[PDB]
């Protein structure tokens, strides 16, 4: 996500993304929810093994 920014130095762009995340503003959360919804969509196949 930090590689979608205009600056030429990745320290600046990493800092910008981290600041945005600190305020709960970025698209990476949707990926987390998608993985968890997928895990739920696969409830019953977990086994003690």
């Amino acid at each position: 996500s930090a590689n979608q920014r205009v600056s030429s130095d990745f320290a600046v762009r990493l800092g910008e993304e981290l600041t945005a995340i600190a305020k709960g503003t970025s698209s990476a959360f949707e990926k987390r929810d998608q993985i968890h919804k997928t895990a739920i969509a696969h409830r019953a196949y977990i086994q003690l093994k």
Binding site: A11, L14, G15, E16, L18, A22
Partner: protein, 50 residues
């Protein structure tokens, strides 16, 4: 006196991991500078510990 005090931590674990992920070709100072530079920025913009 030194009994009750725990051993000070070797080194921060999450920061070491993040640096190692950024680090490449054996260039760790470059990675640490990048991360420390970014953390310095986020503090300056949020004034909260990074």
């Amino acid at each position: 006196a030194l009994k009750s005090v725990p051993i000070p931590p070797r080194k921060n674990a999450t920061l070491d991991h993040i640096t190692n992920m950024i680090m490449r070709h054996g260039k760790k100072e470059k990675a640490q500078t990048i991360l420390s530079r970014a953390l310095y920025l986020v503090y300056c913009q949020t004034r909260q510990d990074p």
